[PDB]
Amino acid sequence: CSIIEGTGNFDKCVSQVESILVAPKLPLPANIEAASSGFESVDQVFRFASS
Amino acid sequence: EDVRKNRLKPLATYCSVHNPEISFKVTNEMQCRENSIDPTKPLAERMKIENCSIIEGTGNFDKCVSQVESILVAPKLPLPANIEAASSGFESVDQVFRFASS
Incomplete structure (x- = not known):
């Protein structure tokens, strides 16, 4: 990779923030504390606990 | 059964x-x-236990130690339902005395 170009698609940006940061396949590195509380990712928080 | x-x-x-x-x-x-x-x-x-009918005893102790080690004591991934152990810093039995000794 040499240059990052901006496409400006918001719907595609939401879809990518979701799969990478919010709801990834494996938990994000250095998150043993979160996993021990029963939450591997952000999506799991409101799925298992709601208020 | x-x-x-x-x-x-x-x-x-x-x-x-x-x-x-x-x-x-x-x-x-x-x-x-x-x-x-x-x-x-x-x-x-x-x-x-898929594709298995009868369990036969070989009586080799050294082979038994080697298998208890790779399966129970020091496996590749931690044994299921061990999140509490992993959160204290120990994925398996071998990691206990490796990181903490007394």
Whole structure:
């Protein structure tokens, strides 16, 4: 990779923030504390606990 | 051959794709698959030792130590339902005395 170009698609940006940061396949590195509380990712928080 | 009296039952019941700890957590699914339990398969198929009819005793102690080590004591991935152990910094038995000694 040499240059990052901006496409400006918001719907595609939401879809990518979701799969990478919010709801990834494996938990994000250095998150043993979160996993021990029963939450591997952000999506799991409101799925298992709601208020 | 009763399901209740089977020693693989608690592990096969935990290793189920219908249990939220498996369906939402891929790490726990791979922990089950590495210990030969397929969470997608039904309960009976999970506890069943596939392509096996009879267990014969060889009596080799050195081979028994080597297998208890790779399976129970020091496995590649931690044994299922061990999040508490991993959170204290110990994925397996070998890691206990490696990181902490007295």
